[PDB]
Each structure stands twice: as C-alpha cells, then as structure tokens.
Design goal:
23% of the residues lie in helices and 21% in strands. It is an alpha/beta fold. Helix 7 packs across helix 10 (415-433). The structure holds ~{N}-(2-phenylethyl)-1~{H}-benzimidazol-2-amine and zinc ion (ZN) (3 copies). ~{N}-(2-phenylethyl)-1~{H}-benzimidazol-2-amine (LUY) is lined by residues 273, 275, 294, 310, 312, 318. Zn(2+) 16 binds at residues 388, 407, 414, 417.
C-alpha cells in the first residue's frame, strides 16, 4: 500500500447538502467519475487524484487549502477561496475579487499556485473540508492524464496550456490556463464530529471566520497541520532540499560553539545545564565546565512551562538551544526560532505557530517576546584564541570592534582571523535571516573576552 486505492470508500455524508441523493456507498473511483474525470485505467504514475494522510504529510509544502461557497452551481456564481487569502468569483455565463468567467478565473489559479509553490514543491495538494461544490468545480480548472515533464525543464508538469498544447512546472507556466494532475485530501474523511469551525477553534484562536471561502480554506489547512504535526509528530520523515538548508544548519552549529565557548570564558561558570534535544552533544568539547544534559523534545503545541521542566526534584548557566519555554530563567543562553519569519522553509502553522521544514518538520509555537524578559538580545561578536597564522581568497584590511582576537587587541587583525571573521559574520547573518533569535543573560559582556589574551 504505497498510494490510496481508488476502490477505497469515501464517506459522502459531508456532501449531501450540496449533492442531495448522493449514494452512501461510494468509492474514490465513482467520486472521480462523478467529478467529471475519466481515469481510463491508466498505469502512468497518477493512480488517484486523492491521497493518503501519510502521502499528504510527506508533501506538506504542497498544501493549499481550497473551499468553494455558492454565492447564489450551473446557474449560480461560486466563490473560490484558497489558503493564500485569495477569493475569486466565477460566474457560469482578505483578497476578495469580482465575478468573472471560468476561462479567466483558471488563468489566475495557475498564476497564484505557481507563484506560491514554485519554491516549495513539485506539486499542489488541495486540502479540503468537502461539501460538494469544490469537487464539482474542479473540472473547470483541472486537467488530468499521465505523469509528464515540463516543456522547458526536467521538473514534473503541474500546468497545461490549451493555447499551445504544452505542459509546464510551476517555474515555466507563465500564461498557462490549467492545473495539471493535482492532488487532494478531504480532512472530513478523518473521522471528526461537528463542523470545521468548531473542530478548528478547539486548537486555534488566530484564524477566524469572516464568512468567506478563504477563511474556511485557511481554517482547513490549519486544522490539517494540527492533526499531522501538532498532535501527531513523525520525526522519521525526511524532506527535500529546496533552499539554504545545509548552510543554515552549519551556521547554527558554528554560532552555537562560538556563543557558548565565549560565555564560559567570560563568566567561568562551573556547571552548564543543557536543556533540550535528547540526541545532543557537548557543543564546546574542550570547555572546563561540568556538562549536564536534560532531555526535552521539540514541543509543537504550547511552549514548555519552566515550572514543569525544572521544579519536580541558579548555579551555573542554562543552555536552551531551540528548547521553547514560556519564560527563560535569567542565567540562560537561548536560541529561539521566530515563527513570524518569511521564508521558503517556514510554512504557516496553527494557533500563531509555524511549520519549519528543514530535513524534518517542526511545528513551533508562536513567538512571544515576553519569554525573554530576564534576558537581553545577544550582540554579534567573533571570538578566537587560535594562533595568527594564514595558511592559503583575497583580502582588504579588516577593521572591526567585534573581532575579539589577539591581533585586534595588539592593534591589527591578521589575514587568517579576518577571513574567519568574515565567514563567521556570513554564517551569523544566514542564521538570523533564517528566523533564529539569540538571547543571553544580562551580565554577558564581550569586554571580558579580551583578558583571555594574557
Ligand atoms: C524529572 C526529574 C528531575 C528533574 C530536574 C532535574 N534537575 C535539574 N534540572 C535542572 C535544569 C536546570 C538547572 C538545574 C537543574 N537541575 C526534572 C524532571
Ligand atoms: Zn519547467
Ligand atoms: Zn487556525
Ligand atoms: Zn590574528
């Protein structure tokens, strides 16, 4: 069982208000047929338009919530809503658009999906809370067939053009009018009691229902992210490299060794309490300090309460490297992912949180500035006790107050420490822009690092 069988049953109870008289016994095969699609027994990599929950999770970057609300359905205008905030009105003749015919509506859909998805995924997955009109309206902007490649590259085809009779990926679909071979999943098939608004509002207060299709589309994908990444966490699932994943991770590791090594040299703590990831290693293996580990997995719902992390039976320093707590103690070094960051790695989440996808998927709770009241923002600095010796990438004399080296203390930064400073500043910028934020105990002062050059 790799894919979802077309002969699997589809519960049609959620469809019988828009589609009265719908058979209670229904398969995906009859549903697809009812929707106006002829699969014609094709063994060509597209076995079903609908997918399993496991396949949807593997493709979370492709998720677009989709809802259709019949404003007045053959004779009536439909309101098409997407989890991008877009509301299009199709006439059968926050971004709310006026009534236009399907031939122009379909052009806008291809443009919107391509601009939203070209840097996230090789496909689209329409996340539904299916009542009927979204499924029946699919024939107006979707064409299906065998799996294909783009006419301008080796990526899989996600669009089709009736104007040129050609196929394209999200990057080369400019002017294409049809969504080709999309995927979809109905959240209403997961066994929920009650309507979408009531199930969604149990876990989220950020999304409301201003009574437009996009509001329901946003609530749909949000409820789907909750079930698959907040209440359920599968950390075995690997995700493709779509950006600066490798650089961002290596940058985070360089920043961590730097920041922790310097705090231990500056304030000479006898013990460091490392709270977080159970698979953690000492980031400064040669430090004098008594290193003590505490296991706490990445919380994906609410930020850990310091009362429960600690008090259950102030000396030294606490290291909270990506361990999201409600209020950090004053003696801490903290790396905290900012869920508000706009990037191709950070997808929107549930209750203000976000889905950060870099190798694994991590739903992170909403960033809260009040978690850091006992700390201050960590300033940039580069520290090095390594010998001044080149080994060699051209040079322009470096002058900086934040290059804490013997050469800068002695009056002139050497070429080696200037290359190492410029590389460290790039890794630092990479990490800050990726969404991470650095915080430290208020007594941290880089002025104390100069006296380690005796
Ligand atoms: C079950 C059993 C015991 C515990 C507390 C362990 N002792 C501890 N954790 C610390 C963190 C930071 C600083 C000092 C600490 N001492 C928690 C859960
Ligand atoms: Zn292409
Ligand atoms: Zn929500
Ligand atoms: Zn030097």
């Amino acid at each position: 069982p790799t894919h979802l069988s077309v002969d699997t049953k589809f519960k049609t109870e959620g469809l019988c208000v828009d589609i009265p008289g719908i058979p209670k016994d229904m398969t995906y095969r009859r549903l697809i047929s009812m929707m106006g699609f002829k699969m014609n027994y094709q063994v060509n990599g597209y076995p079903n338009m609908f997918i399993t929950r496991e396949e949807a999770i593997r493709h979370v970057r492709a998720w677009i919530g989709f809802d259709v609300e019949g404003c007045h359905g053959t004779n009536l205008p439909l309101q098409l809503g997407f989890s991008t905030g877009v509301n299009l009105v199709a006439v059968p003749t926050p971004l709310m658009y006026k009534g236009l015919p399907w031939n122009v509506v379909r052009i806008k859909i291809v443009q919107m999906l391509s601009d939203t998805l070209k840097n996230l995924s090789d496909r689209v997955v329409f996340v539904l809370w299916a009542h009927g009109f979204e499924l029946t309206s699919m024939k107006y902007f979707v064409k299906i067939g065998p799996e294909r490649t783009c006419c301008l590259c080796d990526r899989r085809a996600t669009c089709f053009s009736t104007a040129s009779d050609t196929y394209a990926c999200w990057h080369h679909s400019i002017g294409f009018d049809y969504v080709y071979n999309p995927f979809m999943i109905d959240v209403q098939q997961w066994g929920f009691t009650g309507n979408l608004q009531s199930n969604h509002d149990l876990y989220c207060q950020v999304h409301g229902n201003a009574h437009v299709a996009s509001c329901d589309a946003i609530m749909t994908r949000c409820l789907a992210v909750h079930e698959c990444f907040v209440k359920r966490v599968d950390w075995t699932i690997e995700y493709p490299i779509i950006g600066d994943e490798l650089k961002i991770n290596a940058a985070c590791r360089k920043v961590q060794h730097m920041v922790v090594k310097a705090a231990l040299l500056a304030d000479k703590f006898p013990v460091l309490h490392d709270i977080g990831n159970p698979k953690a290693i000492k980031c400064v293996p040669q430090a004098d300090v008594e290193w003590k580990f505490y296991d706490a997995q990445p919380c994906s719902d609410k930020a850990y309460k310091i009362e429960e992390l600690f008090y259950s039976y102030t000396d030294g320093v606490c290291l909270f490297w990506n361990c999201n707590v409600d209020r950090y103690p004053a003696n801490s070094i903290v790396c905290r992912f900012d869920t508000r960051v706009l990037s191709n790695l950070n997808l929107p989440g549930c209750d203000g949180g976000s889905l950060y996808v870099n190798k694994h998927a991590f739903h992170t709770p909403a960033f809260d500035k009040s978690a850091f009241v006992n700390l201050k923002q960590l300033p940039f600095f580069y520290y090095s006790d390594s010998p001044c010796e080149s080994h060699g990438i051209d040079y322009v004399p470096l002058k900086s107050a934040t290059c804490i080296t013997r050469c800068n203390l002695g009056g002139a930064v050497c070429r080696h420490h200037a290359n190492e400073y410029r590389l460290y500043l790039d890794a630092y910028n990479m990490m800050i822009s990726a969404g991470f934020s650095l915080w430290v105990y208020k007594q941290f002062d880089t002025y104390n690092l100069w006296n380690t050059f005796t």
